[PDB]
């Protein structure tokens, strides 16, 4: 029942505490959690190994003139700086004193890939893959500029 | 002759005995049993090895506001908690005293993967892969709230 465009997605570098921003012109966004469980056989039975889970998210968006954020991303993938991101679902506020902040998932990791693309007579689109680097925390977060 | 939407699919954590729920807005659901049999050759003949069978099921569904279950799933894949699921075919009741409960398959395992996906001007869809962890039992099970 949630229209995808309700999902809002923010990033920022850990070092820049003050800095804040949002990703714009998403077309397709996809999160993923991949459990590595390969059971190794046993004579008396079988055991299901509990392996790490490399969660990652891939999003594609457009690239316009009044923004350079995507350039910061294609910088980070190379410089391999840390970032942290916020997958906040709007229209879902707090419960007691957190109404201004809506539910979200917070996770800190690196951008594992940047790939943009051009097409004669068309707007260029940049895709990015971000590795979450561990457990993703839950709670609520506040948007900037009321949008 | 069975319309797919007749297949009802429930999950719950083993620890939470009381808890009960159902998966909603399925689009495509698929079960699978994969037999690993690789015969190694023999001079006098050939023998067909009997290997383990890693059965798993993959389902895609939609994600709306009055539910967080899918969030519990994307939590389990990471936290690697156990779950147990029920593939109950409705319109198939018991035989003697089990009419209220319809035929079903019960199996306990982990959620091996969660991957959701967004698309501008469209409802976000989440897919999940669940490993069954062993033999799947048969019998009948009762639905909640008559639906």
């Amino acid at each position: 029942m949630k229209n995808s465009n309700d999902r809002i997605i923010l990033f920022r570098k850990a070092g820049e505490k003050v800095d804040a921003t949002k990703m714009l012109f998403l077309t397709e966004y996809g999160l993923s959690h991949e459990a590595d469980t390969d059971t190794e056989d046993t004579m008396d039975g079988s055991y299901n190994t509990g392996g790490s889970v490399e969660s990652t998210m891939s999003g594609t968006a457009k690239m316009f003139y009044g923004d350079d954020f995507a350039d910061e991303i294609e910088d980070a993938v190379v410089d391999r700086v840390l970032y942290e991101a916020w997958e906040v679902e709007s229209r879902i506020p707090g419960k007691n004193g957190d109404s201004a902040k809506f539910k979200a998932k917070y996770f800190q990791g690196f951008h594992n890939k940047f790939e943009l693309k051009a097409e004669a007579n068309g707007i260029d689109e940049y895709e990015y893959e971000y590795g979450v680097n561990g457990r993703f925390q839950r709670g609520f977060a506040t948007l900037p500029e009321a949008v | 002759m069975k319309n797919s939407n007749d297949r009802i699919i429930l999950f719950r954590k083993a620890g939470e005995k009381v808890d009960a729920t159902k998966m909603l807005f399925l689009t495509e659901y698929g079960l699978s049993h994969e037999a690993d049999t690789d015969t190694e050759d023999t001079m006098d003949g050939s023998y067909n090895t009997g290997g383990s069978v890693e059965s798993t099921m993959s389902g895609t569904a939609k994600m709306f506001y009055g539910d967080d279950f899918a969030d519990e799933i994307e939590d389990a894949v990471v936290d690697r908690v156990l779950y147990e699921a029920w593939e109950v075919e409705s319109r198939i009741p018991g035989k003697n005293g089990d009419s209220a409960k319809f035929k079903a398959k019960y199996f306990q395992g982990f959620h091996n993967k969660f991957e959701l996906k967004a698309e501008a001007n469209g409802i976000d869809e989440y897919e999940y892969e669940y490993g069954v962890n062993g033999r799947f039992q048969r019998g009948f099970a009762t639905l909640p709230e008559a639906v």
Partner: protein, 189 residues
């Protein structure tokens, strides 16, 4: 034994919208005195004990084609067996079979002294037609076997009280005969 005592249906005495259920029980028309319904009552999840002393249980039964000019309906008592386990059985009557098709049922209990009652499921039921037929019991039958048996038992109780009051005059003769036979048995051995 030869009888259709294999079926069994559970009645959940709980207030959680227990809907109607097609028990999938299909007796036949030419079946007399051998059609039996095994009920098992359950309070919340485990069996509800019962007894003919404290409570009294009955069941209502109604065909689906019930009209004023043609139909079928009854309400009659049960036959508790293994009460502690909350189990009992009902012998299908003979006149009701003549009416075929779908059927709705119900089982309601009345707790003595208070007359406060309980209603469990309002479940469904089937009855089929066979080739041994031709006689048509189109006449709708509606008899409250509960109160009918009540009045019959009151009449029989009055009659038995009369017979006992008549026998009250024979008790002295019984005493005398018993004493004489005892004295005779003593004098014998």
């Amino acid at each position: 034994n030869f009888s259709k005592d294999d079926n069994l249906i559970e009645l959940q005495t709980t207030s959680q919208y227990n809907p109607v259920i097609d028990t999938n029980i299909s007796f036949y028309e030419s079946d007399r005195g051998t059609g039996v319904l095994n009920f098992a009552v359950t309070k919340n999840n485990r069996p509800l004990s019962i007894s003919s002393e404290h409570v009294k249980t009955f069941i209502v039964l109604k065909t689906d084609d019930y009209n004023v000019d043609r139909g079928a309906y009854i309400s009659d008592e049960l036959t508790i067996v293994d009460a502690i386990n909350g189990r009992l059985q009902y012998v299908i009557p003979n006149e009701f079979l003549k009416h075929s098709g779908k059927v709705h049922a119900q089982a309601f209990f009345t707790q003595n002294g208070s007359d406060n009652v309980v209603v469990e499921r309002q479940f469904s039921f089937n009855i089929e037609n066979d080739l041994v037929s031709g006689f048509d019991g189109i006449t709708k039958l509606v008899y409250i076997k509960s109160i009918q048996d009540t009045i019959e038992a009151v009449g029989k109780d009055f009659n038995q009280l009369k017979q006992n009051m008549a026998d009250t005059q024979t008790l002295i003769a019984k005493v005398n005969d018993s004493a004489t036979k005892g004295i005779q048995q003593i004098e014998i051995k």
